[PDB]
Amino acid sequence: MRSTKVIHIVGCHAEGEVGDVIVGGVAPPPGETVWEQSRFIANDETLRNFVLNKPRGGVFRHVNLLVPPKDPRAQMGFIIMEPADTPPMSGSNSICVSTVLLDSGIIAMQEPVTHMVLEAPGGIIEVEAECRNGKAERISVRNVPSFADRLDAPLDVTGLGTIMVDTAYGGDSFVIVDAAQIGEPGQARELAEIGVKITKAFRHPERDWRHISFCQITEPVTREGDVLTGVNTVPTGTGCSARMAVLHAKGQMKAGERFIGKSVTEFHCRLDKVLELGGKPAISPIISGRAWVTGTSQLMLDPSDPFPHGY
Amino acid sequence: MRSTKVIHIVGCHAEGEVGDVIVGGVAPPPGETVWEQSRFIANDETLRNFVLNKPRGGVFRHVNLLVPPKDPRAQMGFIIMEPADTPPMSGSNSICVSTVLLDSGIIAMQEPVTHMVLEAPGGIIEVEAECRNGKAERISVRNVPSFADRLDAPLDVTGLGTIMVDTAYGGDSFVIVDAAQIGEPGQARELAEIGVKITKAFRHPERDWRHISFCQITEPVTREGDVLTGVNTVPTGTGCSARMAVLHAKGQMKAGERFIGKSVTEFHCRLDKVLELGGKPAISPIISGRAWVTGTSQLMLDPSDPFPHGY
Numbered sequence: 001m002r003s004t005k006v007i008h009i010v011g012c013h014a015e016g017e018v019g020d021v022i023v024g025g026v027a028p029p030p031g032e033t034v035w036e037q038s039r040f041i042a043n044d045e046t047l048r049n050f051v052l053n054k055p056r057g058g059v060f061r062h063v064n065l066l067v068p069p070k071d072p073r074a075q076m077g078f079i080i081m082e083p084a085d086t087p088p089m090s091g092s093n094s095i096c097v098s099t100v101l102l103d104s105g106i107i108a109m110q111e112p113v114t115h116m117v118l119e120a121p122g123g124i125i126e127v128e129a130e131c132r133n134g135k136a137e138r139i140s141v142r143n144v145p146s147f148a149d150r151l152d153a154p155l156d157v158t159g160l161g162t163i164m165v166d167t168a169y170g171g172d173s174f175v176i177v178d179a180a181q182i183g184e185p186g187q188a189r190e191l192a193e194i195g196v197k198i199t200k201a202f203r204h205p206e207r208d209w210r211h212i213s214f215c216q217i218t219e220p221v222t223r224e225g226d227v228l229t230g231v232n233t234v235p236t237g238t239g240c241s242a243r244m245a246v247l248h249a250k251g252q253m254k255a256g257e258r259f260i261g262k263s264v265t266e267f268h269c270r271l272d273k274v275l276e277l278g279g280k281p282a283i284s285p286i287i288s289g290r291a292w293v294t295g296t297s298q299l300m301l302d303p304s305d306p307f308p309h310g311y
Numbered sequence: 312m313r314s315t316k317v318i319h320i321v322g323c324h325a326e327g328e329v330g331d332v333i334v335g336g337v338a339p340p341p342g343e344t345v346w347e348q349s350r351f352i353a354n355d356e357t358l359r360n361f362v363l364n365k366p367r368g369g370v371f372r373h374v375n376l377l378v379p380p381k382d383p384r385a386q387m388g389f390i391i392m393e394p395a396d397t398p399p400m401s402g403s404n405s406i407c408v409s410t411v412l413l414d415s416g417i418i419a420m421q422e423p424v425t426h427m428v429l430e431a432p433g434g435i436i437e438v439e440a441e442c443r444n445g446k447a448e449r450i451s452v453r454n455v456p457s458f459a460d461r462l463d464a465p466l467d468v469t470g471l472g473t474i475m476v477d478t479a480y481g482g483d484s485f486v487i488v489d490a491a492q493i494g495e496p497g498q499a500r501e502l503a504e505i506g507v508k509i510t511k512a513f514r515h516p517e518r519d520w521r522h523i524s525f526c527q528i529t530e531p532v533t534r535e536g537d538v539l540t541g542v543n544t545v546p547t548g549t550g551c552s553a554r555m556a557v558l559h560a561k562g563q564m565k566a567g568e569r570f571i572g573k574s575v576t577e578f579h580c581r582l583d584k585v586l587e588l589g590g591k592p593a594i595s596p597i598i599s600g601r602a603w604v605t606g607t608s609q610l611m612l613d614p615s616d617p618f619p620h621g622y
Contacts, residue, residue, distance in 0.1 A: 004445055005416020006607065008319040008335050024319050024335020027387070027417050028379065068339065068379035076338070105316020105612075106338050134315055134614055296317065298607055301416075303445055 003300035007051070009063065010104055011294035012096040014139075015265040017235060019096025019291070020063040021078075022051070023104065025298070028067045029079075035088070035207065037067055038079040038121035042086040046309070052083055053310030056299050059083060062090070064097050066106075074119035075107060084214075088122030088144070088207055089171035091237035091267070091287040095139045098127045099291035102136040109134065120144070122171065122207060140288035145275050146170035146241045147282040148249040150200055159191050166249075170241025170285060172213050173202050176232075179217045189215045189234065205278025218243065221252070228253060229260045236261045240269050241285040248274075248283050255283075265290070314611035318362070320374065321415055322605030323407040325450075326576035328548065330407025330602070331374040332389075333362070334415065336609070339378045340390075346399070346518065348378055349390040349432035353397040357620070363394055364621030367610050370394060373401070375408050377417075385430035386418060393546075395525075399433030399455070399518055400482035402548025402578070402598040406450045409438045410602035413447040420445065431455070433482065433518060451599040456586055457481035457552040458593035459560040461511050468506050470499055476507070477560075481552025481596055484513050484524045485545065489531075496528045496544065516589025532558065538569040540577075547572050551580045552596035559585075559594050566594075576601075 007025030012018075026047065029037035041047055050056065051063045062082055069077045078097045080090040098116060101107040107116060109131050116127040118141075126142035148168040155165050163181035168174050175196040182188060193215040196202075202212045214234055221230035232243060240261040247253040248271060255274050261267035272284040301308060318336030323329075337358065340348035352358055361367065362374045373393055380388045389408045391401040409427060412418040418427060420442050427438040429452075437453035459479040466476050474492035479485050486507040493499065504526040507513070514521050525545050532541030539558070543550055551572045558564040559582060566585050572578040579599040586593050612619060 002445070003416075004420075006321070007416075008607070008609075010317070022335075024333075025415060025417060104336060105314075105318075106336060109315075134313070296319070296609055298319075 002302055004303050005301055007299045008296065009051070009299065010100050010296050012100050012291055013294055014092045014095040014099070014291035015267055015289045017092035017237060017264065018062050019093040020051075020061070021097055021100040022063060022065045023100070023106070026065060032070070034067060034070050034077045034079070034119055035121050038086050038088070041065070041079055041081065048081045048086070049309040050301070051299065052081065055307070056310060062093055064093050066097070069119055071119050071124055074117050074124055076101060077119035079121055086121070087172040087213065087238065088209060089120045089125070089238060091141070091143065091171060091241060092235070092289070093237070094118065094120060094125055094127070094141045094143070095287070095289045095291045098129060098139045098141065099136050100293060102129055102131060103293050109136070136291070138288060138290050140286060142272060143171055143238070143241045143285040143287055145277045145282045146245040146285050147277055147280055148246040149202055151246065151249055153200065155192070155195060155199055157192055157195050159188060165192065165196070166246050167196060167200055167202055167212060168242040168245045169202075169204060169209075170243070170245055171238030172242070173204075173209060173211060174239065174242045175212045175215045176218055176243060176246055177215060179219055182217060185217050185233075189217065205280070216243070221247070226256070227258050227260055231262045233262065236264050236267045237287070240267060241287060244269065244271055244285060245283050249281065312611075313613055315614050316612055317609050319607065319609050320362070321411050321607050323411050323602055324605060325403045325406040325410070325602035326578055326600045328403035328575075329373050330404040331362075331372070332408055332411040333374060333376045334411070334417070337376060343381070345378060345381050345388045345390070345430055346432050349397050349399070350519070352376070352390050352392065359392045359397070360620040361612070362610065363392065366618070367621060373404055375404050377408070380430055382430050382435055385428050385435055387412060388430035390432055397432070398483040398524065398549065399520055400431045400436070400549065402452070402454060402482060402552065403600070405429065405431060405436055405438070405452045405454070406548070406598070406600045406602050409440060409450045409452065410447050411604060413440055413442060414604050420447070447602070449599060449601050451597060453583065454482055454552045454596035454598055456588045456593045457556040457596050458588055458591060459556040460513055462557065462560055464511060466503070466506055466510055468503055470502055476503070477557050478507060478511055478513055478523060479553040479556045480515055481554070481556055482549035483553070484515075484520060484522060485550060485553040486523050486526045487554060487557055488526065488528055490528045491530070493528060500526045500528065500545075527553070529554065532563070537567070538571055539564060540571045542573045547575045548578050548598060548600070551578060552598065555580060555582050555596060556594050560592070
């Protein structure tokens with residue numbers, strides 16, 4: 001057998017969502033900052049198609065790439081590569097990357113707790129690992145500053161009638177819409193989404209992010225004390241960080257309140273504090289979850305293989 | 312099974328000398344420069360013992376670690392880890408690292424030739440790969456500036472009698488001595504070295520290096536035109552650049568002349584140019600050799616294993 005390249009990946013999933021990590025074989029992308037590097041990865045597409053697409057990885061698969069830190073205070077940097085795009089920050093993946101680091105030995109595992117400082121495309125992230133018996137049990141990450149752009153704003157949907165929605169950002173751009181004003185959601189999702197880029201034009205005060213990536217159809221959230229449980233659906237991960245930003249923009253969640261995202265295993269998260277971002281209110285999310293490694297692999301490519309990018 | 316860490320290595324030998332390369336699992340050592348990083352690797356010892364020592368790697372094994380470049384003009388940096396020490400530059404290994412990069416796909420392979428700029432502990436190195444049919448056939452590296460410290464200097468050897476020797480540096484510190492003034496060698500080797508560290512006390516005008524690493528016993532060299540063929544024993548690659556430096560400090564070799572080192576697969580060399588360094592003359596070695604990849608591996612370490620550093 002012959003290959004034109006070899007990447008070594010350590011498989012890892014967090015509460016179900018796959019978040020494979022590339023530990024070697026791939027040179028750090030060009031760019032002076034991590035942000036730009038992720039961009040390159042998104043434009044080039046060569047790397048994401050090789051690992052994401054088949055016959056190497058079925059649909060709905062994630063794979064994160066470790067890159068040399070570009071920020072003084074950061075032990076390691078990485079880029080999230082979702083089957084759809086390369087977001088500036090992902091919850092489910094910032095969890096896998098945190099886990100692989102510890103379970104693979106790249107970072108020194110301190111018990112019963114170990115503190116890391118990773119650097120995603122969107123910005124630096126604090127991480128608190130709960131390691132026990134040589135294994136990161138639970139990972140708690142301080143996501144980047146999240147916020148809600150528009151709130152209760154009309155939306156001319158060519159679908160049917162007019163409904164009000166809210167746009168937020170908790171690692172990625174979302175457009176939250178109560179399934180009430182909706183009455184297959186996949187179809188109506190693609191619709192409500194595109195419409196938002198048109199009528200509402202999103203903007204991030206610290207990154208060249210200029211669009212609404214997805215739409216999540218939510219349902220009324222219940223309260224059990226300080227723990228709000230919501231059965232929202234586009235997956236989860238950065239989904240909640242965004243919703244909490246809105247939930248906090250409507251007085252439905254105060255600082256110090258823990259939000260529990262639906263069980264895609266229930267993704268935990270808490271509103272650590274409130275911060276002012278780009279002349280606007282923002283929350284400091286605390287996503288937390290459990291990730292297990294699934295193995296290791298070395299992907300290759302035969303030069304005569306008709307699917308160099310994969311079908 | 313359980314492990315406390317995982318390093319992914321791609322096996323590679325150059326003309327026989329093993330030069331395995333670590334592509335992932337290992338975080339870049341602490342230090343503002345590559346030089347200092349290699350040092351750390353040498354002091355810490357934790358990494359070199361894990362990979363070099365058994366039961367993971369028999370004696371006489373080399374393993375190079377790829378590290379994020381610290382020099383603007385360098386696609387990749389690495390540290391050489393020899394079973395004895397961590398030299399500032401190694402020929403046989405600068406060849407394997409060059410090869411792995413291309414054959415593993417870390418670097419874009421251009422045919423029929425591809426130019427890289429690697430960064431070893433001692434300094435930047437130009438590399439010219441002869442790639443054909445998706446495989447680096449031959450690797451030509453422009454070693455760091457080599458030179459000869461002392462020439463024909465007395466040496467009080469407690470062994471027997473007094474002999475004259477010469478000290479040089481071509482990636483590492485050596486003390487060349489004609490087997491004529493010797494009349495086994497391995498035993499009287501480390502013996503003549505200590506003497507050099509005493510009577511001749513080495514110094515490199517750019518690196519912390521200040522001692523004689525090894526000793527090579529040589530005999531007269533033959534000539535067949537412009538190609539000098541000679542026998543040497545001490546580590547033949549980095550030994551050449553040291554030799555030529557002396558052969559050049561004695562008139563026994565001129566710029567543009569090729570030097571073929573004994574086949575310990577004869578390691579080729581050429582004295583590209585003559586430059587100045589630290590106030591004294593020096594040569595610009597051009598090592599050449601062929602390398603292949605032996606495969607890939609992921610080393611591990613059970614916590615209950617009584618040999619964490621290997622015996």
